[PDB]
Amino acid sequence: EMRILMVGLDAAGKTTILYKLKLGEIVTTIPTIGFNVETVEYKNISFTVWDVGGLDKIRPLWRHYFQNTQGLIFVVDSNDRERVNEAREELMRMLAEDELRDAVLLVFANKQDLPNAMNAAEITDKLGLHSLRHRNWYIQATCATSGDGLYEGLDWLSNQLRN
Amino acid sequence: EMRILMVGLDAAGKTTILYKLKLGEIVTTIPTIGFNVETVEYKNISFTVWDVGGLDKIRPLWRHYFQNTQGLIFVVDSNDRERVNEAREELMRMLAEDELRDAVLLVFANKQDLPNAMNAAEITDKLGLHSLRHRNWYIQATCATSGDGLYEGLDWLSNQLRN
Amino acid sequence: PIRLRELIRTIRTARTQAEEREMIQKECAAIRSSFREEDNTYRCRNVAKLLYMHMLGYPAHFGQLECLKLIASQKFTDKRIGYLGAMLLLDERQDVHLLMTNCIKNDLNHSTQFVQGLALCTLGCMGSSEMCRDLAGEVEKLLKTSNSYLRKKAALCAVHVIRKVPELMEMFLPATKNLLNEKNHGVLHTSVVLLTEMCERSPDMLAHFRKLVPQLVRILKNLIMSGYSPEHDVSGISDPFLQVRILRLLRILGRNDDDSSEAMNDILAQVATNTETSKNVGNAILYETVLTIMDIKSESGLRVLAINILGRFLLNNDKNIRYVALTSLLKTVQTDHNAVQRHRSTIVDCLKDLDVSIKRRAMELSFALVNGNNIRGMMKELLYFLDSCEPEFKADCASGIFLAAEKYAPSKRWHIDTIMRVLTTAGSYVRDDAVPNLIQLITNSVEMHAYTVQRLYKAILGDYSQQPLVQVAAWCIGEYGDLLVSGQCEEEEPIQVTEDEVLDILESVLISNMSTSVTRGYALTAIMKLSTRFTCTVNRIKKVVSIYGSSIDVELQQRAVEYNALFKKYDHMRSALLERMPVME
Amino acid sequence: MIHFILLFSRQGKLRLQKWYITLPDKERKKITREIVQIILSRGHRTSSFVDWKELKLVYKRYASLYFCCAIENQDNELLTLEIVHRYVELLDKYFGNVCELDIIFNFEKAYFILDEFIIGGEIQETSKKIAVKAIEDSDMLQ
Amino acid sequence: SKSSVIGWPAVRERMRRAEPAEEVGFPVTPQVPLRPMTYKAAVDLSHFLKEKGGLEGLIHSQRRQDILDLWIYHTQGYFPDWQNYTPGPGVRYPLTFGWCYKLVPVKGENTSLLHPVLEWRFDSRLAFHHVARELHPEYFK
Ligand SMILES: Nc1nc2c(ncn2[C@@H]2O[C@H](COP(=O)(O)OP(=O)(O)OP(=O)(O)O)[C@@H](O)[C@H]2O)c(=O)[nH]1
Ligand SMILES: Nc1nc2c(ncn2[C@@H]2O[C@H](COP(=O)(O)OP(=O)(O)OP(=O)(O)O)[C@@H](O)[C@H]2O)c(=O)[nH]1
Ligand SMILES: [Mg+2]
Ligand SMILES: [Mg+2]
């Protein structure tokens, strides 16, 4: 059992990830206004995953799911150099809360498809993940439309449940 | 104390592993119809290791040692692409039992001698280790005839002894 | 955990077996629970207490894996326990015993000969056919050793793998070459039993092995002439166990050879005279000596002497020797056939002996003694002895009457007369299997069925409950009914055949509960034939077929309805297939 | 070939079975029950042999304990009784004043004595000295 | 001496399997009154040993005594010091006033391969004429 949240910007593939983790296929997904949950069942831990869409009118309501959260997924796009700043703003906005203080971080460099897509390292330092405090943050470069690195992030995450 | 089982296909070097962890040398070993046991003492844990040969006429009898097992080693051959299907069949047949439900899995990628020999990653995805349930599986690429990776698998195994 | 003898002492205090089972399952759980603890300490004794319960007859399937742990132990006592219960709890069909194969193979290479002695013990006692296939090169390797502690063991283990795997002895033909000069007798004994085994299986091995016949003729003569040793000597007779095995090897060799039969002739003439017949041992020496002489193309002076040996053995009051002497002539029935026939009254005497086996050997040898000369007189003893059999011998005699009568019957009538006598007096004792044989020989008989069927009819009015009797009769009434009721289509002067009580006596079987339903199977068969074999009163028998179409036996419900349509629709096609059956052998 | 060996009490209480032939336990419990019944239903002048179902079944009483073998129907019989008696001698050898209650107790070595004497259903040591010597050495090995 | 009948062959077997030539402490049976082996009960016992039989002329020893005496204490409730006899020099007379038996001097596979003591006597005047008191006057006052 683990409460999982999939936060991030819009068009992040986060529902593309979620139905790849639960089902295994890339379903044609609308821009999800509300949220999503599928209990992904993997590595002796049932990951209860609260995927929530990342459009503008939703981001204030993000605080309502930050309770009993054992772990984050802050999905980033590797193909959004223009939005990495507000994502870095979002991250520094969101992590700084007393609620959601003991949940580790697993960042997905989604949409590794282009030379526009960066690696984990540049995305780490554009976000400044070394500036974090009280964090088991761990970026994990993933390809949602091919399942690549997805189970490996879940692998790292399942290590990070027990102590 | 830890009861260890060495299940897997024939000619896997499983007795070669067993007399390299215990003795430290590669003894000339017959194809073992029955079994072997050598209490390997490593990471100050006495690994009582039940090496059982992997021929056709023995594989049904494997169910008899599946009681009070705290740890598996499923050695595969990296030099057997043709046998990885039945090794995948053997694994799914075996792991699906109520007896032997709480024992961790440590897959050895033995016989790393060739470009024929694969790494841990292709052997992970041929066997389909990401399809697993209630498992602390962890593949460990090992070289039986040189001692390489063997005790490091035994290193990780003694971590998964206690919780 | 308590000890073995502490448990046994508690078991010896048990009164009721049900109460004893309470004491079983008391300790058995602790044995199980210790097995859940994976103990190595008391695993010696918990298995030992378990094997006692196994000897006490209790389900000890669970501890068999711990026996494999005790074989795969390192302490000698745990092995000493471990090899034992492997011979006890495991067999070939135990199917979990295959894990011994690695463990034995390591322990055939153990430093201690006693550990290897345990490994040769367990494989020699209960080694499986595939375990024999998986250990064959190691046993001959331990047969190529010099350790006579192991050479005595690897030889008999090689017998076992040749016993279990008959197609494996050819790799032991080189193994056995020229170890016949062993100073030890025990290894030399096991080699003889191996050469007994090697000569037994393949005739192709006989050519290599009849060569060394005079080698052991010397060594057996060495055993007679070494009249004492402090070991091997029982009652002043030196190593009689080896001596018989040589004779048995000399029995299977030279049995169709003559030169080896003459190469062994001297020591046969020796020990037939140079034996001490006082104790049981020298009789056991001389018994195989008789059997060795009979089976080889021997000297005629041996065999005449040998019957004179047996004439002594017929007259010893030891029932052992009487069992020995009766078995002896039971062996050499055909060989020296008429020197047996002069001991005939001794055999008829042992019919009146008060032992089962003595009466068993005498009755069967009397079945063997019947030639075409004693056929008339001895059967009158035997038909009397058939009356004076035990009910266990009544089944045994009445068949063995039928066996020798089919051989050497001087008449066909008297052949019928004795069989008809036995069928009246055996009844529930004569086997149903001889009934198609008796049915065959009386239709092999072609001439006396008016003689037969009347005498068949004259006794079945006495009784029906003798089921193999009335098995015989109903086929005869169906087939040779014309010879029973003859020219009596209508009523005539009253002869004993009356063609209605003829039909009533079969009908009496059909309602009688003492009918094996193949009595009733033969009876409707006889009813339907006497629709053709009798022209007197048919279609009253159609009524009996028609009322039987609702019967509760399945085939006898089939049999009646399948008859009845011929009785109702194809009355002319009834007789169109009721020709008599052909006669075969 | 000795097919099996049975040692059962005056009450028929079996103190030893040794199946040199592989037949299952129900058949073991059937056959053993019958022959004990056969021998105990058999008198003292009944020739010490039973022709039991193609087995010239050898019995030889020595004490309250009874004795049983199943030899192949081509072999010797009095020697087969002597095999029992040689084994009786070896039990008389290794124990001395060989007696009933440690048959109940120390049966484990009586199997081992049989293991030093008969493996496979046949004799391995025709001496009576060398066999009990070897079991003492393995006892001296402990 | 009723419950002394059910172990009359059973404990005597353990006596006879004891050679005439874990655990710590001593339990006491709860709420059962205890008393020494009294005179008339020893008269009740010496006749119980006279009538039930299997005791007279048996090889007496100390190991058999201690098997017997504790069994009396645990099944009948009597202090197991009553089967005391006079020592080595002389006839082993009972110190017990009422015990009419004086002691005069007189499996099989536990033997190795090649090999490299008292008895009772009934004396009915031991209950009255204490002969052990004649052998030990200064101890009995
Ligand atoms: N090429 C490529 N495109 C991807 C990959 N992952 C996601 N995408 C694209 O990103 C788009 C957004 O994915 P969705 O999951 O459907 O939408 P979302 O990110 O969940 O946004 P919301 O629905 O508003 O929560 C998809 O339509 C995909 O085409 C990837 O790994 N490779
Ligand atoms: N080149 C190479 N060969 C290896 C290595 N490990 C094992 N082998 C070979 O694999 C063969 C099988 O090894 P064994 O241990 O003797 O046999 P097994 O795998 O235990 O099979 P069983 O005896 O039936 O249980 C050996 O003969 C080795 O030659 C390795 O690391 N490198
Ligand atoms: Mg979405
Ligand atoms: Mg092996």
UniProtKB/Swiss-Prot annotation, chains A, B:
One Gene Ontology cellular component: protein-containing complex
Activity control summary: Alternates between an inactive GDP-bound form and an active GTP-bound form. Intrinsic GTPase activity is almost undetectable in vitro. Activated by guanine nucleotide-exchange factors (GEFs) and inactivated by GTPase-activating proteins (GAPs).
EC number: 3.6.5.2
Biological process according to GO: cellular response to virus; dendritic spine organization; intracellular copper ion homeostasis; intracellular protein transport; long-term synaptic depression; mitotic cleavage furrow ingression; regulation of Arp2/3 complex-mediated actin nucleation; regulation of receptor internalization
Binding site for GTP: G8, L9, D10, A11, A12, G13, K14, T15, T16, N110, K111, Q112, D113, A144
Reactions this protein catalyses: GTP + H2O = GDP + phosphate + H(+)
Enzyme class per UniProt: hydrolase
Family named by the database record: Belongs to the small GTPase superfamily. Arf family.
PANTHER family to which the protein is assigned, alphabetical: ADP RIBOSYLATION FACTOR-RELATED
Function according to Swiss-Prot or TrEMBL: Small GTPase involved in protein trafficking between different compartments. Modulates vesicle budding and uncoating within the Golgi complex. In its GTP-bound form, triggers the recruitment of coatomer proteins to the Golgi membrane. The hydrolysis of ARF1-bound GTP, which is mediated by ARFGAPs proteins, is required for dissociation of coat proteins from Golgi membranes and vesicles. (Microbial infection) Functions as an allosteric activator of the cholera toxin catalytic subunit, an ADP-ribosyltransferase.
Protein name in the entry: ADP-ribosylation factor 1
Organism of provenance: Homo sapiens (Human)
Lineage of origin: Eukaryota, Metazoa, Chordata, Craniata, Vertebrata
Protein encoded by which gene: ARF1
Swiss-Prot record, chain C:
Membrane topology designation: Peripheral membrane protein
UniProt key word Protein transport: yes
Location within or outside the cell: Golgi apparatus; Cytoplasmic vesicle, Clathrin-coated vesicle membrane; Cytoplasm; Cytoplasm, Perinuclear region
Gene Ontology CC annotation, any one: trans-Golgi network
Tissue specificity comment: Widely expressed.
Top-rank taxon: Eukaryota
GO biological process: basolateral protein secretion; intracellular protein transport; melanosome assembly; platelet dense granule organization; vesicle-mediated transport
Keywords carried by this UniProt record: Coated pit, Cytoplasm, Cytoplasmic vesicle, Golgi apparatus, Membrane, Protein transport, Transport
Complex and partners: Adaptor protein complex 1 (AP-1) is a heterotetramer composed of two large adaptins (gamma-type subunit AP1G1 and beta-type subunit AP1B1), a medium adaptin (mu-type subunit AP1M1 or AP1M2) and a small adaptin (sigma-type subunit AP1S1 or AP1S2 or AP1S3). Interacts (via GAE domain) with RABEP1. Interacts with EPS15. Interacts with SYNRG/gamma-synergin. Interacts (via GAE domain) with AP1AR (via coiled-coil domain). Interacts with CLN3 (via dileucine motif); this interaction facilitates lysosomal targeting.
Free-text function comment from the UniProt entry: Subunit of clathrin-associated adaptor protein complex 1 that plays a role in protein sorting in the late-Golgi/trans-Golgi network (TGN) and/or endosomes. The AP complexes mediate both the recruitment of clathrin to membranes and the recognition of sorting signals within the cytosolic tails of transmembrane cargo molecules.
Family the UniProt entry places it in: Belongs to the adaptor complexes large subunit family.
Protein name: AP-1 complex subunit gamma-1
Organism: Mus musculus (Mouse)
Curated annotation (Swiss-Prot), chain D:
Alphabetical list of Pfam families matching this protein: Clat_adaptor_s
Domain of life the protein comes from: Eukaryota
Membrane topology: Peripheral membrane protein
Keyword Transport applies: yes
GO MF annotations, alphabetized: clathrin adaptor activity
Listed GO CC annotations: AP-1 adaptor complex; clathrin-coated pit; cytoplasmic vesicle membrane; cytosol; early endosome; Golgi membrane; intracellular membrane-bounded organelle; lysosomal membrane
UniProt xrefs under InterPro entries: AP1_sigma (IPR044733), AP_complex_ssu (IPR016635), AP_mu_sigma_su (IPR022775), Clathrin_sm-chain_CS (IPR000804), Longin-like_dom_sf (IPR011012)
UniProt-listed GO biological process terms: intracellular protein transport; melanosome assembly; platelet dense granule organization; protein targeting; vesicle-mediated transport
Cross-referenced SUPFAM superfamilies: SNARE-like (SSF64356)
Keywords: Coated pit, Cytoplasmic vesicle, Disease variant, Golgi apparatus, Membrane, Protein transport, Transport
Keyword Membrane included in the entry's annotation: yes
Subcellular location as annotated: Golgi apparatus; Cytoplasmic vesicle membrane; Membrane, Clathrin-coated pit
Tissue: Widely expressed.
UniProt-listed Gene3D superfamilies: 3.30.450.60
PANTHER family (UniProt xref): ADAPTOR COMPLEXES SMALL SUBUNIT FAMILY
Quaternary assembly: Adaptor protein complex 1 (AP-1) is a heterotetramer composed of two large adaptins (gamma-type subunit AP1G1 and beta-type subunit AP1B1), a medium adaptin (mu-type subunit AP1M1 or AP1M2) and a small adaptin (sigma-type subunit AP1S1 or AP1S2 or AP1S3).
Its biological purpose: Subunit of clathrin-associated adaptor protein complex 1 that plays a role in protein sorting in the late-Golgi/trans-Golgi network (TGN) and/or endosomes. The AP complexes mediate both the recruitment of clathrin to membranes and the recognition of sorting signals within the cytosolic tails of transmembrane cargo molecules. Involved in TLR3 trafficking.
Family: Belongs to the adaptor complexes small subunit family.
Protein name: AP-1 complex subunit sigma-3
Naturally occurring in which organism (per UniProt): Homo sapiens
